[PDB]
Amino acid sequence: VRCSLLRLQETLSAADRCGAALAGHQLIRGLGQECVLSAVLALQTSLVFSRDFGLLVFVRKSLNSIEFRECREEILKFLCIFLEKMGQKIAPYSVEIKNTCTSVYTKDRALDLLIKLLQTFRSSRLMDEFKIGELFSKFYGELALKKKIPDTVLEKVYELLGLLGEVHPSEMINNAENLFRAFLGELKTQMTSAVREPKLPVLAGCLKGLSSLLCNFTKSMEEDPQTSREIFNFVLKAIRPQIDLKRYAVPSAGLRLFALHASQFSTCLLDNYVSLFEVLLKWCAHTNVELKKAALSALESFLKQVSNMVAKNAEMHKNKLQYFMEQFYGIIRNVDSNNKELSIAIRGYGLFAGPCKVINAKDVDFMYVELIQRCKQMFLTQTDTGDDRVYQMPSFLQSVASVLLYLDTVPEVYTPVLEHLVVMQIDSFPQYSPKMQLVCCRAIVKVFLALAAKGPVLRNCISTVVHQGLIRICSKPVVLKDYVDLFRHLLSSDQMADEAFFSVNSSSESLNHLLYDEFVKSVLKIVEKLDLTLEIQTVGEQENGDEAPGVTSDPAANLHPAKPKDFSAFINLVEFCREILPEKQAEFFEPWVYSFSYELILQSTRLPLISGFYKLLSITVRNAKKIKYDPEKYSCFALFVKFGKEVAVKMKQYKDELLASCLTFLLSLPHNIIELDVRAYVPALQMAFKLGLSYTPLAEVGLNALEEWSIYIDRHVMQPYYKDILPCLDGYLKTSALSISLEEIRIRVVQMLGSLGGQINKNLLTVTSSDEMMKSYVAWDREMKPVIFLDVFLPRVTELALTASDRQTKVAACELLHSMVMFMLGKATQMPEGGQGAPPMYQLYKRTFPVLLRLACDVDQVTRQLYEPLVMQLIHWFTNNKKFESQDTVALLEAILDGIVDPVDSTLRDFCGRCIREFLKWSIKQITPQQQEKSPVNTKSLFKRLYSLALHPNAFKRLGASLAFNNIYREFREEESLVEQFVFEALVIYMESLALAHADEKSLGTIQQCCDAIDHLCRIIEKKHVSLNKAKKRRLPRGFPPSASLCLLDLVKWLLAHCGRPQ
């Protein structure tokens, strides 16, 4: 493109080349502000630069020095701040920038040009760190010398030599050394008579220079005590000049790198200067003058050197140590009167640096009782909002360790004090900067390092309470200002340790007591506490019968969800060191077994966390085939398969969408160890991951469970299993592949089909015979004629099953099907005889439509509300005025009590609310009282169809249905005249027939509870009466203890002491 620079430059530079007499200085200051203002930055950078060398170098370098300096004065100031602002990747550009700055210094051969040349020297050390640097560093060395004319140029060369030391060039090993030996010679000859104070260059230059260099020179030779005491001491006495408080930050930043060199001369002469070194420090924390962070670094560094010189001494000397540190004690007691506020740090870590030499002359635990008490006041008051944010709080806590460690005796009762000092500083971690967090990692080890030498009892109570203080503060967790990411700092913490090994153990103790807070147990009755409080006199009996098969302290169920998520990313990947298997293996299998099966979904997911993780279970599988044909891992291989057997069967079916979601990723790792036995009995598993195929590409969920099964059971020597296995397996996996991204799902679907060479044909074959093809409808049942009632029907069907793509598809489509069904009446409205295809092909047409309104209740919410009123606005019309044709509505409803085929635990019940309702507008349809007995299509046929369905085929799953249905309309069957009398004999036939039907389920197929919510509904029925039926129904059950069959009688026995009462 054209850009704004290629044109602005060749216009206003080819014009300033012939007319810059004041008409350029105002122009380039403007164009200068343009280039300063900042795709736009990168292109402006690359093009201005390639043009700056091709246009403003050899043009502005000519002309006059004055005409081009004011140009270069401003150009150097905006280019330099831009070089710091512009991103990197300008290494060849820089090489040209180099050849340019040596040309601007060449035109400099002038005070405003020297300082803008200084501006070129800062952005010279930007990248560096290359051999390309020294190939020109060697030759820039000479121009650095040659002071020549008396100018303010001593600052420069010592600054450029620093640009060397910041680039750190090994090749500058000869020239650089011969330079500083003269800068040394220069500054020493200055002071006495010429000027009382060194100039601006002799200050900021040779100081900033004599600072950044010294990385190689060792020892003193008396060079350091003469240089530093005369000069550095004096830059640490000035108060009055403004920018002097920034000429104070570079000499003290000098002493911090001087650390090792400052030690060789201060160790000689810093003792009787206990006033000198301490005045400059205290005197520094006076005015936060741009260099508050230069007070801290000058001090905290020079104090780590103090700590050095304390151990860098024998026990001798000692007098000067005791003196200073008791002055440090003086700071501790006058803060009470007047608050040091930040000089509280100077004594805090001032207790950190030299804590130890003194305790050999005098017992000085006491500083600790105090400092603890002192920090017990920094954090007890923290019940107030005067302390904004926990600044520095691990820094005094660093001294905590530093002195807790050394002492030999164990202190008292203040133990719980540095304890709640842990939990909160463990909470002080997340709110932080990256640099700040690293030091805190170190602080934790010291507390642990010393605490572990005396009494470990303590850091345990840390952790149960320190996690609990993390599930609940994570309440309203961020799964939609603190979260679990922080403890993803422990690994760093884990990285150094014996304590780390101990810490891993602590977590297990942690939650392996935390859910036992009954905390899981309580929200279970919340399920049943949410339908029982919605109780009046008419709605309460219907909230009771209508119940979905299978699934208060909301701060607990909610608390519990956070922990599994919290742990999964944590353990599993850190090396176990073989530590995890002994605790994790059988023993751990054991808390899991004891704690599992309550019915909570998240916990089940949690067990799989160490499930894939054990590094070497090849013992758990290979020694398991030898126990069936060391005792600890066997005994868990028990609970595994034993635990494993009681998994999918007891929870793949009464599963529902969500705790099958959450109950068949468990089930995809039990084959790992026990592989040869899990193929026979539980093959259905990846097969049953048909519903987990289209909602997995959001989180690689249930479909991730089809791929790792084959691949691992491919790595399985068992060849003769495929016949049972691969027919019905990939007999569907083919169609999860017609399209971690959803097509990279298909990528690995390729690598697996074909890896078996002639084992994929055995798939789409039984893909096509078991699936059954397109069913189809038969015989196809005022300007233009449109009827075509079939061709328009099927597609509206085909859309409402998927209902996807915003439902913008689904929305208008079923809405279309609505006005469509209304049209099915329209021909069955005239007085003809043809078109009588409308009934039996409405049989095919009345599909299990309610499955639209019910799964619309989950997501659509509006669609169901269109569709609930329809199915009841439709029951009455056929039932009230029509007969001979209703049957089919019974047919498929009675087939919704088949729907338990697909354990869609919502749909089963989702209909039952229609049985009652169909029969309801029957109850207002008392019609045909002479024709109830003359025409047979009424209640007699009804309860025949019903009871005969409870007991069909040894209660073959068609039962259990007949438990909820009876319950739904129990409320209305209540109210019946002498009708519920001669039919009350089947009531107890029902009673007796119903209990037996299932006492040989033998499988907790979850009906046993529905059946009891039925019998007491038969005990209200009594109402005295004339009881001609009674004489029997107490003979009848008297002789039923024997049928036994397991659970019968156990309930029938209450029934006869009860019935043995009214008569």
Binding site: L380, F519, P555
Partner: protein, 634 residues
């Protein structure tokens, strides 16, 4: 409930055996450390000792108050934190704690200036018996003084009424930033007890704190402060005020001989009751003044109906100031008891306004008036009971207002802010005369006695002429007989003061004038030939030209041509000189806005008859021809 009461009497029949062994632990005066522990226990005990018998110290638990003392006296640190408990609420104790709790706030709590800078949660309580607060936590000497007060105030008010005398000493002497902490902690505690007697005890207490005693001055100023808040937020079911004000009724007649402090003490303790009268009124005045009838009527006659005027020698500086403060709320008792309010209907007596001349003179105080005053609220308050008794042209003539007016003296400054809330619900038809009358008065207004101007007075008198705007009945009946020196001196002052908006960086200058002229079209456009005679076209050798551009234009061409070029260039050819500067350009931007307006000016002028303006357009074109030189790129 079983284990709670089974540990205490054995912790008490051994509290004799083992604390007689902690004897040297208790009063190590080596047991310096050991003793600080013994407190924690007493605390941990006192917590499990709250239900039933062990809570009471009289009877079966014997004197353990023996053991609280020995610790308030030894030393000062960590004592702060073994302290907020206790809460023994009986006599004899009173002599002990007060004598010792006072001798402790003398070296612990200073009068000096602010020398400063469900489930699962159980484990939060298990980790809560070893001292401190683990949940309640999620310069140095100043913020722990603030924390002791926290510890002093958290429990605080609930334990005893007597406890309250001691926080009062701290509200006095000097102010400090605990002010908000109190209002937060003292409101939520007067209402937290929600048990009577207790309530009225605190009352009957502090009432006697205002009984006879030899205090100083500030002790009764900040008294009112921490007083009104103890009282104006509280519960109900009260007769404490009928009989104590049955005593204070007899305290109505009071007279003071001249004295340095005699007048103030008598009238201090006299502002207090009428001050407690009205928050005890309003809420409980309609039932109590209706049952009292004549007695309540006689105080509303003695009390108010008095204006302090003609007085001299002190009397005014500090008392008339607080005398008016309860004069209007003394009328609030009659507003809490009026059907057609007679003291409202009309005024009593003759004389100067009650409010101080100096406050008006101060101007700054007037600004506070904007902030509002206690005196200001009752008038605002009356509005509440006046729109419930308020009721075309026959509906505009009557509604008081004419009672009040404005007058021809000086301290009209008051009546104004009073109307600032008044036109909140006094606008349009209800009253016609007030809107018209107000305009004739903001002539010199507040900003003529104030040459610098004010964000306080402008915005107001600015917005006051924003509601007279849009009012049909207020824009024209003062536009035909008397939009003369009224409207003239208005527009003249407007332009003459909208100077230096350049130092302000405020576009507001424009909208404010534009919205104004928009609707007061009527009245001769005296600004038309006078803004032109203002010219403002200073030579561009400076940024002063910028201060003339928007002026010349943004005003003009709004809906109807205003004046148009024709009536400006008629009284003087200063448009010829406004052309001589448009040609002159110094500033980089906004110079054209000039030519921009000429465009719109020439457009709607040739739309009009024009013809006479046509010769001018040729000269204009001759200008753009006189240009092109120097570059022609801009």
């Amino acid at each position: 409930d079983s284990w709670w009461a089974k540990d205490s009497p054995l912790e008490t029949k051994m509290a004799v055996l083992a604390l007689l062994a902690k004897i040297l632990q208790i009063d190590s005066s080596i047991s310096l450390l050991a003793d600080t522990k013994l407190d924690l226990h007493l605390k941990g005990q006192a917590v499990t000792l709250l239900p039933f018998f062990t809570s009471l110290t009289g009877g079966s638990l014997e004197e353990l108050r023996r053991v609280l003392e020995q610790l308030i006296v030894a030393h000062f640190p960590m004592q702060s934190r073994e302290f907020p408990p206790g809460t023994p609420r009986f006599n004899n104790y009173v002599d002990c704690m007060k004598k010792f709790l006072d001798a402790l706030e003398l070296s612990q709590s200073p009068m000096l200036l602010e020398l400063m800078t469900l489930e699962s949660v159980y484990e939060m309580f298990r980790k809560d018996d070893p001292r401190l607060s683990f949940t309640r936590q999620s310069k140095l000497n100043e913020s722990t003084f603030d924390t002791q007060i926290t510890k002093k105030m958290g429990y605080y008010k609930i334990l005893d009424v007597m406890y309250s005398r001691l926080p009062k000493d701290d509200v006095h002497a000097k102010e400090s930033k605990i002010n908000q902490v109190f209002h937060g902690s003292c409101i939520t505690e007067g209402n937290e007890l929600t048990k009577t007697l207790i309530k009225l005890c605190y009352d009957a207490f502090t009432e006697n704190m205002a009984g006879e005693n030899q205090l100083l001055e500030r002790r009764r100023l900040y008294h009112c402060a921490a007083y009104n808040c103890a009282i104006s937020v509280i519960c109900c079911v009260f007769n404490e005020l009928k009989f104590y004000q049955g005593f204070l009724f007899s305290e109505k007649p009071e007279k003071n001989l001249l004295i340095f402090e005699n007048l103030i003490d008598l009238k201090r303790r006299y502002n207090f009751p009428v001050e407690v009268e009205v928050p005890m009124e309003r809420k409980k005045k309609y039932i109590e003044i209706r049952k009292e009838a004549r007695e309540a009527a006689n105080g509303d006659s003695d009390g108010p109906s008095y204006m302090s005027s003609l007085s001299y020698l002190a009397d005014s500086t500090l008392s008339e100031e607080m005398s008016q403060f309860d004069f209007s709320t003394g009328v609030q008792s009659y507003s809490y008891s009026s059907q057609d309010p007679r003291p409202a209907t009309g005024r009593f007596r003759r004389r100067e306004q009650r409010d101080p001349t100096v406050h008006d003179d101060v101007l700054e105080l007037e600004m506070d008036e904007l902030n509002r005053h206690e005196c200001m609220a009752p008038l605002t308050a009356l509005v509440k009971h006046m729109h419930r008794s308020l009721g075309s042209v026959p509906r505009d003539l009557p509604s008081w207002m004419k009672f009040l007016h404005g007058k021809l003296g000086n301290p009209i400054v008051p009546l104004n802010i009073r109307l600032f809330l008044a036109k909140l619900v006094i606008n349009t038809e209800e009253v016609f005369r007030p809107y018209a009358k107000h305009w004739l008065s903001p002539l010199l207004q507040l900003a003529a006695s104030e040459n610098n101007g004010g964000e306080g007075i402008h915005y107001m008198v600015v917005e006051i002429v924003a509601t007279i705007l849009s009012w049909t009945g207020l824009a024209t009946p003062t536009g035909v007989p008397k939009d003369e020196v009224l409207a003239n001196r208005l527009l003249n002052f407007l332009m003459k003061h909208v100077f230096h908006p350049k130092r302000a960086v405020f576009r507001h200058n424009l909208e404010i004038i534009k919205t104004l002229v928009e609707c007061w079209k009527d009245c001769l456009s005296i600004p038309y030939r006078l803004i032109f005679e203002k010219f403002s076209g200073k030579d561009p050798n400076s940024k002063d030209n910028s201060v003339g551009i928007q002026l010349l234009g943004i005003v003009m061409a709004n809906d109807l041509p205003p004046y148009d070029p024709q009536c400006g260039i008629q009284s003087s050819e200063y448009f010829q000189a406004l052309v001589n500067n448009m040609s002159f350009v110094r500033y980089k931007e906004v110079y054209a806005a000039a030519a921009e307006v000429l465009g719109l000016i020439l457009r709607y002028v040739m739309e009009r008859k024009n013809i006479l303006e046509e010769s001018l357009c040729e000269l204009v074109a001759k200008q753009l021809k006189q240009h092109q030189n120097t570059m022609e790129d801009k």
